[PDB]
């Protein structure tokens, strides 16, 4: 057929009977670092089975009056086993992710999602003088959410979570220029993207620079008649690919 | 120059010690001499010019304020306000000026 | 002692000239480039990318995500109008802030055809048919389904697939068209009518929605670069 | 030549190959051409996409910042850190992309203005200005009558009135492989302090001053600076900024509706 | 050195750098195949997408 | 070379081939040469029709419009929509044809004039003017101290006194394939409103202003604009305008006799 | 540092000169021409066309 | 490049456009056969027009 | 009478430019060079030379 | 091209060839590369040492000395012996080597300043300056109105305001085969008198004056002189000067610690 | 005359001296073997110095 | 800018409603803010500046005039003059000024 896929990595597997095609970044497939571009003076390490697998983040509920969700990418896997462990002892490191989000519904529900992965997503504070603090900008594999109301002004260090501006001050409609897929509960069941390493330096630290952001914005809100299941959860499972690190040090 | 929080709201009880922090970092394009001020709007209350302190300016607050850190050229302009009273409500301005940068911090203290 | 003569146009600073200039730092060795993915090379690699159209403004669905949802419900009478808007992709208050709009708002003359992808984001058991018509200018807007099916139109059916790309053709006397709101170079109107009603089984919502995208065909072009009328400024930041 | 593609003729078909219906879920934009949904005539197309390229869209000068400094005063001189965040007609053209790489061509348009002098029979000769460029880290002057101005090996330019505006070229000066018009992530490993601040794009300062002395009456001048990105290459496009800018450091804003509104969906 | 214009035209480089040459204005090349169709399997126009 | 034809000799004939009598009804102008109605000598002719061609008849600069703007005033600045209908010594040379096609070469001759100042010891440095060109549709400035001037990517030119007059070249900017110096027919499909108005020849505006400030005494300036149609090609010639123009939009007039008169038909 | 000398006749604006000039809009692609009928090429294609002569003026 | 004048003269194009070249001044070609004799059948001079 | 146009950036003195210049004393014959030992040719022949590090400052 | 050397891969060895331990007594600096004490990846290196060469380090103009001279005064004129010892931002760049050899490119940036005149309606035309260069031994002028100025065959330059700054080139003028920036040893065979003084680097004087006369009000001018060592070759490098200079003749100083201090050896 | 830059560039000498030519800027040659290792017997890296 | 009829003659009877129309179109070279005036020469009678109406200027005509259309930015400057009287004879000037264009209309009303 042409509806089924079977993705495997490391020692994990993802299978979906009903899904659309897979969108591969900007046309490039994630690979290691060639030696024309390398800048580190030493030799990097490559676990290659201990990290390249599918970690599963926490779940989120898709209520009728939902607004959105976002995860900061090389920060959400900070606590997932060997990836988070190699992310601490080293100093540099590049990766390439294979994001997969999955939300299933029956044939009697209706709704739609926009699964976009905006690179270098800089967000704006609620107060025009301050900037958002770390605690309210991201969470360890936890989903921060947008809102439908403009956040007030008396808040000191918070994020402006008005969804019609995507938090970045940009129009929410024009977000499709980035790689994306639509979760449409009519015909689609799962969206999957393959995002290479996008940054202006060959390697970078991973505790100070969240060089991606996976957003989910419900355009056509969920709706159903009385009787059907009132609880429809969403679950995203992210998997690094072609990872390597440099510069050993102590823990931090 | 850049202050971590250009304005916030602080609340302390009368008779406590008031912490009014003022942190900053230094961009590469800053190489001039250091200058740090502190204002109050109910008027300078303490200066740091030429690596020496001049802090007898506000008669209402004599000795009731003094810098905390011993590395004032590293990004610490905080002041230790002790023995809070009722006539100490007013907006503070941590004005630091290193050539050629400038940055402020508006601390509105309420009690 | 070569003899020269200075023609008019000397000692002037043209804002858009291309001349050589003495280097400020000689023998500076720049850092070698890197194959960073996603290299744009012509701003017509952005007009090709779809972007939803806020076609439900209604003065209160604007400050929300409702501006992009087109109301489609199970009507009782046949032959009702769903939406409709003039096609001026630089002056209209609908195609203005789309991804095509902020590329057109830098140039003045454009050309080529435009596609309009629709996507029925409704339930899974519901069907229906819609008539997407594009009436070239000269008369008013069409007001009856009998009138708009005279122009160019597609009769969309919803099934397994969930889209239908009405491509408005390039039908105009001039080789280009202005992006400002003019009358000498109007570009017609776009409408969308009920072909047949929207039917649903029991225990399924009758209020469905539709999204609409916009993009350019592979014969788009622009000209006569200018600045945008959107961003103002009174003092420096 | 960068010509656009012409259109080929068609005939009224009746087959099972439907080009119209597709699936927009796949994130794959349509690829149909009008020759696939109606009858078209073979039209040779001579239009050209040359004036929409990157170097025809960016290589145009735009004012960035302008300062004033009086003659008859102590430390009458203008400083300025080099950044494009301040003017908004140019800031927005550089936010359409994330990683740019270009070399520059400055240009200064210096003017003068006689101040309300008080003596009698005021007459001053032509003026001469100096525009000193300090790399990030060098020593900075404190006043006009200072010895960091002459005894220096920084690049500076001397210009006098009534002539063509000066102009120098600056190559690609950065630590990485592209300027970053956006940077999400802190600058201290402890994740404190300022949020969107990067050393990657720093370029130094610009100190300007008079060279003459105070003859009889003050003279306030004014200098305007113009960029010109050449040899530019852009990466990772980005949607255009909608909400009005508020600060020069971060991207703060106030929420505003997507578009201006109309009276009804069918009008 | 000598090339065509929008007949011919002559250009000569004077200074001994690279950031001193004039603008190019003539890099006419595009490839939207990485923004329009960034999918893994090729999509044919006529046959349905599923 | 474009030489004219010489004349060939003739002899006194007596035949049935009459070249003189023809029929002017056929709308076919005669084609006789003096060698067909009298005896002529073989005269080599070296005259040349070069200085009567189109590019020798049109490619000569001609003032179009000139405006004044004071320095010491608010919004002291000149605007002008670009059209050749206003001056009549050039308008008539462009009405001889219907569809022209040319690229342009502007030229501005800016002058100054000191106003009746009131303070003592007035002395101003050299001045600098800016001539901003706004395409049709761009944002227009409202006052001199405005931020649409610097932060802009429109083509503008900066010029200071005592030098050669500025000059820029503008290519063929139109929507059709030729400028229309005439257009009979309305501009609304309902056939209402203005009569002879066309979007085909619009070219934008021109905003000009001072760059200096108000030192001590006002300075009123003046700018004159000069066209120069090059590469021109003309189509569908037209009789020359006789009645005096009255307006810049339409072709209104008052009726006037064909020629000045004489005392009698035989004088 | 080529040595040049400026001859008289510089920094002047002759009304009927022919020189090159910097373009205001670079890389502007004009619209292709059309074979419009009736192309004049020399104003001596108008002197060849007959026109009636007002030879009875007589002031009324 | 090098051509004759009203001896020879040399011209060099500098800018990289087409609307920047100097005037032509040397397109000497005429054809009044479309304004003088715009008739369908050829008209000979000698023989009468009818 | 060659026609020229003066581009912006004229009559300026850039501190780090490289142009030719008229000689002040023409036909000056310099004294011939001598093979003096220890010829540096790039300031990266000085960074290669060790130098003790004052790593016990301690303010006294 | 002057490229730096890349780094070659390595494997974990266990052998008797120790590259780390060496003997620093031999005055032979180490020569190890990181590929000899750890595992490295083969990194192609494209960095270039071009902008660190001698001619990229020295051939940049630097102010040397500047003097003022009034118009309305007797013997209002500036003299200066040619030496680089006076300004310290350039002196230190020339002490890094002992024997330099370069030809020069002077440049003078002359400015004027109107003095507090007393009459009414002061107005002066453009000024003209003369910069006379006297070789070591020639006759020197005593006042402005003197006949050693015109009737002379020394190299001088005449310059008037509002134009580009003058510039002349001076070849390698010395008695030895290199300028000596240091000379230990007296200058009299009896070992008396001044200590570090050498005839090897003398270059003469520089006399400057006005050319106009005293019209109605004094005018004080100012001239700045800029060097530019070209074709330079350096010999016998030298550690950089630490203690602050005090005089222009000798190398006197006051003792100062090696570096600024820290609180403890482990911080 | 014509040489490469940091493409090509053209340089022409006008004056009849040698101290009038522009700066060289392109003498890229180094040899630290007289400052780093100024010893009489060659020192190999691997084997010990004694 | 362009008015359809820069001047005409209108005739109405006393006690009727007087229609003084003022239509216009917008050329492409017009992009400034909108301004519409109305004069009388027996003095402004109604303004439209900044998308808001200011129309209490002529004491003789209070409430007796008001714009007709609800799309005043589309080319409608007409006024609805009601209850015509005998002191309302005079020439009207519909002066509309959109940067950078200007156009007038001379309505000479006679009764």
Write the secondary structure of chain J as one string of H (helix), E (strand) and C (coil).
CCECCCECCCCCCCCCCCCCCCCHHHCCCCCCCHHHCCCCCCECCCCECHHHECHHHHCCCEEEEEEEEECCCCCCCECCECCCCCCHHHHHHHHCEEEEEEEEECCEEEEEEECCCCCCCCCCCCCEEEEEEECCCCCCCCCCCCCCCCCCCCCEEEEECCCCCCCCEECCCCCCCCEECCCCCCCCCCCCCCCCCCCCCCCCEEEEEECCCCCCCCEEEEEEEEECCEEEEEEEECCCCCCCCCCCCCCCCCCCCCCCCCCCCCC
Q: Cα separation of A55 and A99, whole Å? A: 10
Measured between alpha carbons, how far is D23 from C161 in angstroms, rounded to an integer?
A: 6
Which residues are CB-contacts of J201 (< 8 A; sequence separation ≥ 6)? Answer: J83, J174, J179, J180
- The two beta strands, B39-41 and F219-227, are unpaired
Three-state secondary structure readout of G32-43: CCCCCCCEECEH
Distance of CA F217 to the CA centre of its chain: 37
Q: Whole-angstrom distance between the N-terminal and C-terminal Cα of chain K? A: 53
Q: Which DSSP state fits F7?
A: B
Resolution in A: 3.8
C-alpha neighbours within 13 Å on the C-beta side of residue D15: 12
Measure A139 CA to nearest chain D CA, in Å: 13
Distance from CA of D237 to the nearest CA of B (A): 28
Alpha helices, H only, C8-164: 101-104, 145-148
**Residue F164: which of C8, C90, C176 has the nearest Cβ?**
C8
Residue A192 lies in a domain: yes
B101 phi/psi in degrees, rounded to 5: -100, 165
Name the residue with tokens 């195609």: C95
A/J interface, count of CB pairs below 8 Å? 25
Among residues F93, F88, F83, F95, the alpha carbon closest in space to that of F60 is found at F93
Beta-carbon contacts of residue D260 (< 8 Å; ≥ 6 apart): C57, C62, C93, C96
Point out which residues pair with C174 in neighbouring strands.
none
CB < 8 Å to H16, chain E:
3, 5-6, 9, 11, 25-26
Q: Is G27 in Cβ contact with D50 (below 8 Å)?
A: yes
| Cβ atoms C178, L28 nearer than 8 A | yes
**Neighbouring-strand partners of residue D219:** D114
- Domain assignment of residue A200, given as a range: 5-246
Of I13, I43, I50, the CB nearest to J57: I43
- Domain count for chain B, please give it: 1
CB atoms within 10 A of CB H41: 6
Count up the domains in chain H and report the number: 1
Task: Please tell me whether residue A194 adopts helix, strand or coil conformation.
Answer: strand
With CA atoms as reference, report the closest residue to B75 among B39, B40, B34, B108.
B34
The residue among F231, C209, E22, J113 whose CA lies nearest residue H15 is E22
After which residues does a break in chain C occur, C–N more than 2.5 Å?
none
CA distance C132 to C154: 5
**Total Cβ atoms within 10 A of residue J3:** 14
Q: What's the Cα-to-Cα distance from A49 to each of A43, A93, A98, J182, K26, rounded to whole Å?
A: 19, 16, 15, 66, 51
Query: CA of H28: how far to CAs of D74, D116, F58, H31, in Å?
Result: 69, 63, 15, 11
- Who contacts J49 (Cβ-Cβ below 8 Å, separation ≥6)? I42, I44, J2, J3, J4, K28, K30
Whether I20 and chain G come into contact, CB under 8 Å, resolves to yes
Domain ranges of chain F: 1-267
Are the C-beta atoms of B69 and B78 separated by less than 8 Å?
yes
- CB contact (8 A) between residue K29 and residue J2: yes
Approach to solving: cryo-EM
Element (H, E) at F226: strand F219-227
Number of neighbouring beta carbons within 10 Å of residue I47? 10
Chain-chain contact of D63 with F151 (C-beta, under 8 angstroms): yes
Residues from chain E that touch G26, judged by Cβ atoms under 8 A, are 25
C-alpha–C-alpha distance, residues J256 and J185, integer Å: 26
**Does chain H reach chain G with at least 3 CB pairs under 8 Å?**
yes
- Of the candidates F64, F58, F60, the residue with the CA atom closest to the CA atom of residue F100: F58
* Tokens describing residue G21: 């000039």
Terminal alpha carbon distance of chain A: 50
User: Distance between CA C167 and CA C155 in Å, rounded?
Assistant: 13
User: Looking at beta carbons, which residues of chain G come within 8 Å of C17?
Assistant: 22
Q: Per the structure block, which two tokens stand in for C152? A: 């160019």
DSSP secondary structure, chain I, as one string:
-EEE---SS-S-EETT------BSSTT--PPPP---S-EE-BGGGTTTS--------TT-
Indicate the residue of E33, E38, E50 with minimum beta-carbon distance to A179: E38
- Partners of A190 in beta bridges: A102
Q: Burial-class residue J234 by CB neighbours within 10 Å (0-12, 13-18, 19+).
A: buried
Q: Write the DSSP symbol of residue F189.
A: T
Interatomic CA distance for residues A67 and D10, integer angstroms: 47
Distance CA D69, CA D215 (A): 16
Check if the beta carbon of residue D238 is closer than 8 Å to that of residue A177.
yes
**Alpha-carbon distance values, H49 to B12, F16, F17, F18, H32 (Å):** 116, 13, 11, 10, 20
CB F210 within 8 A of CB F111: no
Rounded distance, CA F201 to CA F184, Å?
14
Distance CA F50, CA A143 (A): 81
**DSSP for residue D57:** H
Alpha-carbon distances of L54 from C184, L20, L46, L64, L76, rounded to whole Å: 33, 19, 6, 14, 17
Task: Say if residue B99 is exposed, middle or buried (CB neighbours under 10 Å; 0-12, 13-18, 19+).
Answer: middle
Which SS3 state, helix, strand or coil, does residue C148 take? helix
User: Residue J41 and residue J39: Cα distance in Å, rounded?
Assistant: 7
Q: Which three-class secondary structure state does DSSP give residue D55?
A: helix
Q: Which residues contact L99 (CB under 8 A, 6 or more apart)?
A: F79, F140, F142, L30, L31, L32, L33
Asked if D152 contacts J62 with a C-beta cutoff of 8 angstroms, the reply is: yes
Which of A129, A136, A156, A158 is the best residue to mutate to test the B interface, defined by the most B CB atoms within 10 Å of its own CB?
A129
CA triple D114-D115-D118, angle to 5 deg: 115
Q: Which residues of G touch I1 (CB under 8 A)?
A: 7, 9
Chain C residue numbers touching L25 (CB-CB < 8 A): 183
User: How many degrees, rounded to 5, is the angle at CA A133 between CA A129 and CA A135?
Assistant: 155
Residue in D211, D215, D213 with CA at minimum distance from that of residue D117 = D215
Six-digit token pair at C169? 């053709």
Cβ neighbours around J252 below 10 Å, total: 9
The beta-carbon neighbor of C27 closest among J46, J47, J50 is J50
Beta-bridge partner residues of B9: B108
Neighbours of H12 (CB within 10 A): 11
Q: What is the DSSP letter of A140?
A: T
Angle, alpha carbons C204-A1-D19 (nearest 5°): 75
Query: What does the DSSP 8-state code read for residue B71?
Result: -
Antiparallel, parallel or unpaired: β D179-180 and D97-105: antiparallel
Q: Which of A71, A136, A158, A169 to mutate to test the interface with D (most CBs of D within 10 A)?
A: A169
If DSSP codes are grouped into helix, strand and coil, which group holds residue E40? coil
Strand B106-110 relative to strand B7-11, pairing: parallel
CB contact under 8 A, A156 and B6: no
Chains that touch L (3 or more CB pairs under 8 A): C, F
CB F149 within 8 A of CB F132: yes
Task: List residues bridging with F207 in a β-sheet.
Answer: F132
Residue range(s) defining the domain that contains residue H47: 1-50
Q: Is residue A251 part of a domain?
A: no
The one-character DSSP state at C101 is H
Query: What whole-number distance in Å separates Cα of residue A175 and Cα of residue D183?
Result: 18
Check: CB of residue C143 under 8 Å from CB of residue C74.
no
Residue F92 and residue D109: Cα distance in Å, rounded?
41
Q: Does G2 touch chain C (CB under 8 A)?
A: yes
């Amino acid at each position: 057929s042409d509806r089924v896929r079977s993705i495997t990595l490391g020692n994990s597997t993802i299978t979906t009977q009903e899904c659309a095609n897979v969108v591969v970044g900007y046309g490039v497939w994630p690979e290691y670092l060639k030696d024309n571009e390398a800048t580190a003076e030493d030799q990097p390490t490559q676990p290659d089975v201990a990290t390249c697998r599918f970690y599963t983040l926490e779940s989120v509920q898709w209520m009728k009056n939902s607004a959105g969700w976002w995860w900061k990418l090389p920060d959400a896997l900070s606590q997932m086993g060997l990836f988070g462990q190699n992310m601490q002892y080293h100093y540099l490191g590049r990766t390439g992710y294979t994001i997969h989000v999955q939300c299933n519904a029956s044939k009697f529900h209706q709704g739609c999602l926009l699964v976009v992965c905006v690179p270098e997503a800089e967000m704006g504070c609620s107060n025009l003088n301050n900037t958002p603090e770390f605690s309210e900008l991201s969470g360890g594999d936890s989903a921060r959410m947008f809102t439908d109301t403009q956040v007030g002004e008396s808040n000191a260090k918070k994020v402006q979570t008005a969804v019609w501006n995507a938090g970045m001050g940009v129009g929410v409609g024009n977000l499709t220029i980035f790689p994306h897929q639509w979760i449409n509960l009519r015909t689609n069941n799962s969206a999957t993207l393959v995002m290479p390493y996008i940054n202006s330096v060959p390697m970078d630290n991973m505790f100070r620079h969240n060089n991606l952001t996976l957003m989910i914005i419900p355009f056509v809100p969920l709706n159903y008649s009385e009787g059907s299941s009132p609880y429809v959860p969403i679950t995203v499972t992210i998997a690094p690919m072609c990872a390597e690190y440099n510069g050993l040090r102590l823990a931090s | 120059l850049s202050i971590t929080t250009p304005e916030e709201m602080i609340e302390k009880a009368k008779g406590e010690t008031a912490y009014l922090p003022c942190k900053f970092t230094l961009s590469p394009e800053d190489q001039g001499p250091l200058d740090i001020e502190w204002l109050i709007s109910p008027q300078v209350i303490i200066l740091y010019s030429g690596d020496k302190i001049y802090d007898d300016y506000y008669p209402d607050l004599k000795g009731r304020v003094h810098f905390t850190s011993n590395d004032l050229k590293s990004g610490d302009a905080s002041i230790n306000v002790t023995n809070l009273q009722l006539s100490d409500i007013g907006t503070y301005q941590c004005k630091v000026k290193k050539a050629p940068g400038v940055a402020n911090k508006k601390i509105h203290l309420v009690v | 002692g070569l003899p020269v003569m200075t023609t008019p146009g000397s000692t002037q600073f043209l804002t858009s000239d291309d001349f050589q200039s003495p280097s400020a730092m000689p023998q500076f060795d720049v850092t070698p480039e890197m194959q960073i993915p996603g290299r744009v090379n012509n701003l017509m690699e952005i007009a090709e990318v779809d972007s939803v159209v806020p076609v439900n403004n209604t003065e209160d669905n604007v400050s929300s995500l409702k501006a992009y949802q087109i109301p489609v419900q199970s009507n009782s009478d046949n032959g009702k109008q769903v939406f409709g808007f003039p096609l001026q992709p630089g002056a209209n208050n609908v195609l203005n802030r789309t991804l095509l709009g902020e590329i057109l708002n830098y140039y003045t003359h454009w050309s080529g055809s435009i596609k309009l992808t629709f996507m029925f984001c409704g339930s899974a058991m519901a069907t229906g048919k819609f008539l997407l018509a594009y009436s070239p200018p000269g008369a008013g807007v069409p007001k009856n389904r009998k009138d708009a099916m005279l122009g160019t139109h597609v009769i969309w059916d919803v099934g397994l697939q969930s889209s239908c790309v009405l491509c408005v053709p390039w039908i105009s006397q001039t080789h280009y068209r202005y992006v400002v709101e003019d009358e000498y170079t109007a570009a017609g109107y776009v409408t969308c009518w009920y072909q047949t009603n929207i039917v649903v089984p029991a225990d399924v919502q009758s209020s469905c929605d539709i999204l609409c995208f916009v993009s350019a065909c592979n014969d788009f072009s622009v000209r006569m670069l200018k600045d945008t009328p959107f961003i103002r400024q009174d003092t420096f930041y | 030549v960068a010509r656009v593609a012409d259109t080929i003729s068609s005939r009224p078909t009746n087959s099972e190959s439907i080009p119209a219906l597709t699936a927009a879920e796949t994130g794959h934009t349509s690829q149909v051409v009008p020759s696939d949904t109606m009858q078209t005539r073979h039209v040779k197309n001579y239009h050209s996409r040359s004036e929409s390229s990157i170097e025809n869209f960016l290589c145009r000068s735009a004012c960035v910042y302008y300062a004033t400094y009086t003659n008859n005063s102590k430390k009458g001189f203008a400083e300025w850190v080099i950044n494009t965040r301040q003017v908004a007609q140019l800031r927005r053209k550089l936010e359409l992309f994330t990683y740019l790489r270009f070399d520059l061509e400055l240009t200064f348009v210096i003017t003068s203005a006689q101040q309300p002098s008080t003596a009698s029979s005021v007459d001053a000769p032509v003026q001469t200005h100096q525009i000193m460029y300090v790399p990030p880290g060098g020593p900075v002057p404190t006043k006009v009558k200072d010895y960091a101005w002459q005894t220096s090996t920084n690049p500076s330019v001397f210009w006098t009135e009534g002539n063509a505006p000066p102009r120098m070229s600056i190559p690609f000066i950065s630590i990485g492989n592209a300027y970053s018009c956006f940077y999400d992530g802190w600058t201290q490993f402890s994740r404190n302090g300022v949020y969107g601040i990067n050393t990657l794009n720093n370029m130094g300062t610009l100190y300007m001053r008079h060279v003459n002395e105070a003859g009889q009456g003050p003279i306030k001048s004014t200098v305007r600076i113009y960029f010109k990105p050449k040899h530019v290459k852009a990466w990772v496009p980005r949607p255009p900024r909608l909400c009005q800018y508020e600060k020069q450091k971060n991207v703060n804003f106030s929420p505003i509706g997507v578009t201006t509104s109309r009276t009804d969906i069918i009008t | 050195q000598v090339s065509t214009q929008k007949i011919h035209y002559t250009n000569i480089n004077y200074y001994k750098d690279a950031a001193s040459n004039s603008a190019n204005r003539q890099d006419f090349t595009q490839d939207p195949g990485k923004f329009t169709e960034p999918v893994k399997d090729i999509m044919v126009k006529t046959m349905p997408a599923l």
